[PDB]
Design a protein around this ligand. Structure first.
Ligand SMILES: [Zn+2]
Lengths: 52, 42
C-alpha cells in the first residue's frame, strides 16, 4: 500500500517565479518499532507502550 | 524498594528524576510488597 501511495504522487518542478529544484521519492522502507532510550536501543513491546 | 520489569533487580530509588532502572534501561518499576500483617474476615 505505501509503495503504491508514494509512487502515485508526482513532484513537479519547483520555481519561485536558470536554477530549479526537483524532488523524487525512491523505494519506501519501514523498519520494526524500537525504543530510543538514553543508554541504548531497546526492544519495544505493546505492553511497554501501554504502561508508558 | 521497587522491582523492575523484565529484569529482576530492586531499584530502591526515591529521587524524583530517578525513574529508569539501573543497568537495565527500561523505565517500568513495580512497587514491592513488604512484610506487613493484614487481617481479613473470611
Ligand atoms: Zn531493569
Amino acid at each position: 500500500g505505501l509503495q503504491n501511495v508514494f509512487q502515485s504522487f508526482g513532484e513537479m518542478l519547483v520555481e519561485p517565479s536558470w536554477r530549479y529544484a526537483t524532488v523524487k521519492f525512491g523505494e519506501v522502507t519501514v523498519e520494526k518499532p524500537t525504543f530510543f532510550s538514553d543508554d541504548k536501543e531497546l526492544e519495544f513491546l505493546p505492553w511497554h507502550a501501554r504502561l508508558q | 524498594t521497587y522491582v523492575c520489569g523484565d529484569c529482576g533487580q530492586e531499584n530502591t530509588l526515591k529521587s524524583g528524576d530517578v525513574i529508569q532502572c539501573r543497568e537495565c534501561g527500561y523505565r517500568i518499576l513495580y512497587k514491592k510488597r513488604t512484610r506487613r500483617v493484614v487481617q481479613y474476615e473470611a
